Amino acid sequence: MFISRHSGEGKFLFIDQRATLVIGFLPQEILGTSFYEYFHNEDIAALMESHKMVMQVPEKVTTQVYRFRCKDNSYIQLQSEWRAFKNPATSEIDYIIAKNSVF
């Protein structure tokens, strides 16, 4: 329900027009920060493994439903669909596309 794009390490590079109303953060507040900054304590470990698998496989990877910390430091429940694209000349990830569903 909002799209973001991340670096190979998870740093926010882009959020769409629909994100701020959901998570409360202005783009200048969240761009440049890692998505490990916002994951709930109980979800970060499973999300790291999802992140690892995305960086390995050519395929889409869907996360579990997890809690994402909003600007007011409360949490909303997201489920993200992640896919990484690697520069064929350098093998490094150009970006990770993220479809972030909201509940």
PDB file of C-alpha atoms in Angstrom:
ATOM      1  CA  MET A   1       0.000   0.000   0.000  1.00  0.00           C
ATOM      2  CA  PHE A   2       3.153   2.091  -0.069  1.00  0.00           C
ATOM      3  CA  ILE A   3       6.309   1.498  -2.104  1.00  0.00           C
ATOM      4  CA  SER A   4       9.854   2.020  -0.862  1.00  0.00           C
ATOM      5  CA  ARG A   5      13.264   1.221  -2.338  1.00  0.00           C
ATOM      6  CA  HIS A   6      16.346   0.267  -0.343  1.00  0.00           C
ATOM      7  CA  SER A   7      20.072  -0.192  -0.758  1.00  0.00           C
ATOM      8  CA  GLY A   8      21.622  -3.640  -0.558  1.00  0.00           C
ATOM      9  CA  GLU A   9      22.003  -3.081   3.191  1.00  0.00           C
ATOM     10  CA  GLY A  10      18.449  -1.783   3.677  1.00  0.00           C
ATOM     11  CA  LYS A  11      19.035   1.980   3.666  1.00  0.00           C
ATOM     12  CA  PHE A  12      15.896   3.848   2.585  1.00  0.00           C
ATOM     13  CA  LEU A  13      16.497   5.382  -0.848  1.00  0.00           C
ATOM     14  CA  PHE A  14      12.904   6.242  -1.804  1.00  0.00           C
ATOM     15  CA  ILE A  15       9.391   6.224  -0.373  1.00  0.00           C
ATOM     16  CA  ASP A  16       6.340   6.967  -2.488  1.00  0.00           C
ATOM     17  CA  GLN A  17       3.611   9.580  -2.018  1.00  0.00           C
ATOM     18  CA  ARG A  18       1.564   7.237   0.191  1.00  0.00           C
ATOM     19  CA  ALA A  19       4.086   6.347   2.917  1.00  0.00           C
ATOM     20  CA  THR A  20       4.100   9.423   5.173  1.00  0.00           C
ATOM     21  CA  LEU A  21       0.402   9.128   6.041  1.00  0.00           C
ATOM     22  CA  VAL A  22       1.047   5.513   7.075  1.00  0.00           C
ATOM     23  CA  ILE A  23       4.304   5.679   9.061  1.00  0.00           C
ATOM     24  CA  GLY A  24       4.334   9.384   9.982  1.00  0.00           C
ATOM     25  CA  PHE A  25       7.916  10.019   8.834  1.00  0.00           C
ATOM     26  CA  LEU A  26       8.684  12.732   6.323  1.00  0.00           C
ATOM     27  CA  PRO A  27      10.866  11.514   3.427  1.00  0.00           C
ATOM     28  CA  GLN A  28      13.789  13.624   4.661  1.00  0.00           C
ATOM     29  CA  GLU A  29      13.347  11.960   8.060  1.00  0.00           C
ATOM     30  CA  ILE A  30      13.519   8.346   6.852  1.00  0.00           C
ATOM     31  CA  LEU A  31      15.591   8.488   3.640  1.00  0.00           C
ATOM     32  CA  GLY A  32      19.186   7.538   4.385  1.00  0.00           C
ATOM     33  CA  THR A  33      18.234   5.394   7.391  1.00  0.00           C
ATOM     34  CA  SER A  34      18.252   1.607   7.555  1.00  0.00           C
ATOM     35  CA  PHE A  35      15.031  -0.333   7.896  1.00  0.00           C
ATOM     36  CA  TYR A  36      16.702  -2.075  10.847  1.00  0.00           C
ATOM     37  CA  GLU A  37      16.094   1.221  12.679  1.00  0.00           C
ATOM     38  CA  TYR A  38      12.311   0.709  12.627  1.00  0.00           C
ATOM     39  CA  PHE A  39      11.712  -3.038  13.031  1.00  0.00           C
ATOM     40  CA  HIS A  40      10.193  -4.277  16.283  1.00  0.00           C
ATOM     41  CA  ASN A  41      12.573  -6.060  18.666  1.00  0.00           C
ATOM     42  CA  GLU A  42      10.617  -9.290  18.208  1.00  0.00           C
ATOM     43  CA  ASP A  43      10.644  -9.157  14.397  1.00  0.00           C
ATOM     44  CA  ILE A  44      14.137  -7.928  13.479  1.00  0.00           C
ATOM     45  CA  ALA A  45      15.791 -11.360  13.513  1.00  0.00           C
ATOM     46  CA  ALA A  46      13.317 -12.972  11.107  1.00  0.00           C
ATOM     47  CA  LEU A  47      13.464  -9.872   8.897  1.00  0.00           C
ATOM     48  CA  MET A  48      17.263 -10.078   8.699  1.00  0.00           C
ATOM     49  CA  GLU A  49      16.952 -13.622   7.344  1.00  0.00           C
ATOM     50  CA  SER A  50      14.381 -12.435   4.804  1.00  0.00           C
ATOM     51  CA  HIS A  51      16.777  -9.612   3.912  1.00  0.00           C
ATOM     52  CA  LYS A  52      19.623 -12.117   3.555  1.00  0.00           C
ATOM     53  CA  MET A  53      17.572 -14.382   1.280  1.00  0.00           C
ATOM     54  CA  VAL A  54      16.574 -11.433  -0.940  1.00  0.00           C
ATOM     55  CA  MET A  55      20.243 -10.579  -1.454  1.00  0.00           C
ATOM     56  CA  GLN A  56      20.944 -14.184  -2.468  1.00  0.00           C
ATOM     57  CA  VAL A  57      18.031 -15.189  -4.696  1.00  0.00           C
ATOM     58  CA  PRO A  58      16.761 -13.776  -8.033  1.00  0.00           C
ATOM     59  CA  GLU A  59      13.225 -14.018  -6.664  1.00  0.00           C
ATOM     60  CA  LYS A  60      10.639 -12.057  -4.734  1.00  0.00           C
ATOM     61  CA  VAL A  61      10.594 -12.688  -0.987  1.00  0.00           C
ATOM     62  CA  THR A  62       7.610 -11.914   1.242  1.00  0.00           C
ATOM     63  CA  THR A  63       8.197 -11.180   4.916  1.00  0.00           C
ATOM     64  CA  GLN A  64       6.096 -12.254   7.844  1.00  0.00           C
ATOM     65  CA  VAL A  65       3.677  -9.652   9.126  1.00  0.00           C
ATOM     66  CA  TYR A  66       5.901  -7.480  11.311  1.00  0.00           C
ATOM     67  CA  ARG A  67       5.649  -4.338  13.430  1.00  0.00           C
ATOM     68  CA  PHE A  68       7.161  -1.121  12.060  1.00  0.00           C
ATOM     69  CA  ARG A  69       7.941   1.771  14.396  1.00  0.00           C
ATOM     70  CA  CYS A  70       6.143   4.971  13.420  1.00  0.00           C
ATOM     71  CA  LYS A  71       7.113   8.582  14.084  1.00  0.00           C
ATOM     72  CA  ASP A  72       5.097   8.672  17.325  1.00  0.00           C
ATOM     73  CA  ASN A  73       7.081   5.546  18.376  1.00  0.00           C
ATOM     74  CA  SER A  74       3.991   3.363  18.218  1.00  0.00           C
ATOM     75  CA  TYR A  75       3.942   0.397  15.844  1.00  0.00           C
ATOM     76  CA  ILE A  76       1.914  -0.513  12.775  1.00  0.00           C
ATOM     77  CA  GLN A  77       1.756  -3.958  11.199  1.00  0.00           C
ATOM     78  CA  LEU A  78       3.345  -4.279   7.760  1.00  0.00           C
ATOM     79  CA  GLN A  79       4.045  -7.082   5.350  1.00  0.00           C
ATOM     80  CA  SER A  80       6.727  -6.303   2.780  1.00  0.00           C
ATOM     81  CA  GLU A  81       7.374  -7.910  -0.591  1.00  0.00           C
ATOM     82  CA  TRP A  82      11.067  -7.486  -1.422  1.00  0.00           C
ATOM     83  CA  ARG A  83      13.070  -8.015  -4.604  1.00  0.00           C
ATOM     84  CA  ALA A  84      16.681  -7.042  -5.301  1.00  0.00           C
ATOM     85  CA  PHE A  85      18.301  -6.167  -8.631  1.00  0.00           C
ATOM     86  CA  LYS A  86      22.047  -6.607  -9.156  1.00  0.00           C
ATOM     87  CA  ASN A  87      24.233  -4.683 -11.598  1.00  0.00           C
ATOM     88  CA  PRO A  88      25.262  -7.409 -14.098  1.00  0.00           C
ATOM     89  CA  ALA A  89      28.672  -5.759 -14.534  1.00  0.00           C
ATOM     90  CA  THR A  90      29.603  -5.460 -10.839  1.00  0.00           C
ATOM     91  CA  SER A  91      27.193  -7.981  -9.170  1.00  0.00           C
ATOM     92  CA  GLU A  92      26.232  -5.356  -6.559  1.00  0.00           C
ATOM     93  CA  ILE A  93      22.622  -4.559  -5.700  1.00  0.00           C
ATOM     94  CA  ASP A  94      21.401  -1.377  -7.375  1.00  0.00           C
ATOM     95  CA  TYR A  95      18.260  -1.274  -5.222  1.00  0.00           C
ATOM     96  CA  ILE A  96      15.667  -3.425  -3.473  1.00  0.00           C
ATOM     97  CA  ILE A  97      12.071  -2.751  -4.476  1.00  0.00           C
ATOM     98  CA  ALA A  98       9.660  -2.943  -1.536  1.00  0.00           C
ATOM     99  CA  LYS A  99       5.873  -3.270  -1.634  1.00  0.00           C
ATOM    100  CA  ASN A 100       4.798  -2.534   1.946  1.00  0.00           C
ATOM    101  CA  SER A 101       1.258  -3.658   2.773  1.00  0.00           C
ATOM    102  CA  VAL A 102      -0.465  -2.060   5.764  1.00  0.00           C
ATOM    103  CA  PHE A 103      -2.820  -3.632   8.301  1.00  0.00           C
TER     104      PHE A 103
END
